[PDB]
Every structure is written in structure tokens, then in C-alpha cells.
Design a protein around this ligand. Sequence first.
Ligand SMILES: O=C(O)[C@@H]1C[C@]2(C(=O)O)C=C[C@@H](O)[C@@H](C2)O1
Ligand SMILES: O=C(O)C(=O)Cc1ccccc1
Length: 386
Amino acid sequence: HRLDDITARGVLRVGTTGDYKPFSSRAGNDFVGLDIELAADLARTLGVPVQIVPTSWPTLMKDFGDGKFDIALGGVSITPERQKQGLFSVSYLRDGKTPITRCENSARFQTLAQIDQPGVRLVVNPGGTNERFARSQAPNAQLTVYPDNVTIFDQIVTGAADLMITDAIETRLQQRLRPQLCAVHPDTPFDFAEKAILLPRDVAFKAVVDKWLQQRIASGAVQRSVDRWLDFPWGLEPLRLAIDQRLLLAQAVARAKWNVQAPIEDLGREAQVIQAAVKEGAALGLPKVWIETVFRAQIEASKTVQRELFAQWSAQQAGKFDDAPDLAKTIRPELDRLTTQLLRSMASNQTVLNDEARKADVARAMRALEARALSPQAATQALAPF
Ligand SMILES: O=C(O)[C@@H]1C[C@]2(C(=O)O)C=C[C@@H](O)[C@@H](C2)O1
Ligand SMILES: O=C(O)C(=O)Cc1ccccc1
């Protein structure tokens, strides 16, 4: 050999699902997380760039068999099924199986006796140790199984489910991200699982990986990384997404303006925009100066997109577009919705955004905008206030 093939191809290909913070999370076309760092470190060690190849729990083992990637990670537990189709590295994290519940329900689910009752709505992700644990150790509970992380935690906050039993490190993170939730005794779990890297059936390759991984464990680098990634400002994702979507919508603004011969810059509608933003943002307890800086940057980024598209259409001598939505009617509602999302997310994240020491993490969290492909200058101006 596998090493031979990786050398000859010039890339380490790494399968991951990118929906399991803090191991592996997709921000745009970017992946970030503890397992992403590990992959990039192993690649560097092997003398090649890394390529992250997205996959999903249902196609994980198939994609692996189809040769879509060399190794797989992303908070992958050692299970017997996965063992039958490859080798695992040595484990780099031993983690507990423990509950996360609405905080007011914490005392109701501290024992497996309480949990394993006919009344209990237990949700879990499919195909791994959590589902095996739930079916085995809480069979008297009503069990539902979901492929999407967001859905499980939303279900628990919103009262559609009662608890999840999952890795302790997830309970720790989600307790922070979803303040209505509490991990239940995560340091003293019901059982343990081992996180490892899924490797091909190549004993020599495994020896190289194991040698590298054990050095990183012994040196404290893995523990250091776990701690940083658990502390990472994952709650910035809605703010990144609102910025990115607002900016991508400027393509539609530009199409509509081109058709009716409207100037790009409209300092009147700009005043209305900043004014409504300052009003709503002030009700959220955000300082007016924060708000004005951020939205002035968003408006300028938008015009930069518009001007670049007009510049292309001018040279190409483009006519009218039939794929052009109504500006005042349907685009500006969307813009207003995204403005609200951006303000609410700023408010949720105000401590992180106020901490100079976090700038590097904030950069990592926010820099991956799809809109960059559309305009690198616009992307930089949108992110400049942060
Ligand atoms: O006319 C427009 O609608 C768009 C949107 C914009 C904004 O992003 O809010 C507001 C006013 C205009 O100057 C620019 C930026 O074009
Ligand atoms: O791999 C498993 O065994 C799992 O069940 C762990 C898990 C936890 C949360 C999201 C995805 C996978």
C-alpha cells in the first residue's frame, strides 16, 4: 504494498463522513477536526499531500472496498464488521458510552435501570457501537436511528427524543454547543469504545502507521490535539454559512440588475439595511459599532461580486437572463432572513468573537467560503471584520 501505491500515486486518500465534530466536520469544501489533522500529519510523514474523500456511513465500507480511499477515519470505532474488511491502527482514543439529556432530565437518566424502560425515547446513530449498545443494554426502550448528527441533537433539545447514549467526548462538546443539554457522568461511563484508523489488509503498512501514531500518543500530541479540537469554536458554523449564502445570493442580485439596467451601488437601500441591522442587533445586545462594521463589509463584498459579474457580462456582450429572480420581491426577503441569521449567530458567538487570542481558530472556522471560488476579493472583504 500500500505504501508503494501511495508513493506512486503521490497522495494519501482518506475517507471520512465529515459530520462528527470534533473528529471530522465539513465546512464548505473544507474539512477540519482532530482526525483531519491526524490525516494531514500522517501524509506529511509519508511525503505526500493528503486528499480528504467524503463518504457516508452506508457506503463507508463499500467505498473502502471500491478503492475510493486508502484509509478511513472520523471518530471511527473498532467494530467486528469493520475488522472483517480491513485492519485497524492502534487506538488513539478510548472513550466512554454515556448519556446526554436535557439538563433538567439529568437525574432521570443516570442509571441503566432508569434508561431501559418502556417509556424512554432513545435515539442513536446507525451501524456502530452506539446502536449495538442501545439494542443490547436498553432493549425495553423505544429506539430510533438517524444518519444525521444535527437531527439527533435537535430532537433531544426540542423534546422529540429523550436522550442519546454516545461517546463521552461528543456529550462534552454537545453540552457546550447546545446549552439546554448536559452530559451525564462522562468520566464514569457504562462501557468504553476505541477510536482508530481503518487501514487496508497490509501488515507492513499497519506497522508504519502504528509507529507514527504511538510516537504522537507518547509525546502528548494526540492529547493536545483532542483538547484544542474540543475547545474549537464550532458554534461559528451558522455565522460562516450566513455570510457565505448572503454573498452567493449577490449572483442573483446581479442578474436581476443587469436586466433592468440598475446601478450596482444604491447607498439608499444600504442605509435601510444598516439601520434595520443595527436595530435588530441592538435588541440582541450587540454593540452598534460591531454591527455597522460587519454589515458595511457584507454590502461591499456583495458589490464586489456584482461588479465582477457585470465586468464579465460587459466583455462577453451578454444579453438578458431568463434565470433571473425578482429582486425586490424574492431576493431581498432572503437577504433579510440571512441578515437575521448573521446577527443571531454573532450574538451566540460574542465571547469568541471578542477574544483576540482566538483569531487563528476563528480564521480556520470561517475562511472556507464557497463564495471565494466566485470572488476571492469579495470573500476577503466579507471576512475582514472578523
Ligand atoms: O441593491 C441591492 O439589493 C444589492 C444588495 C446590497 C446588500 O447586500 O444588502 C444593498 C444595496 C446595494 O448597494 C448592493 C448591496 O446590491
Ligand atoms: O462509531 C460508532 O460506533 C459510533 O456509534 C460513534 C458515533 C457517535 C456520534 C456520531 C457518529 C458516530
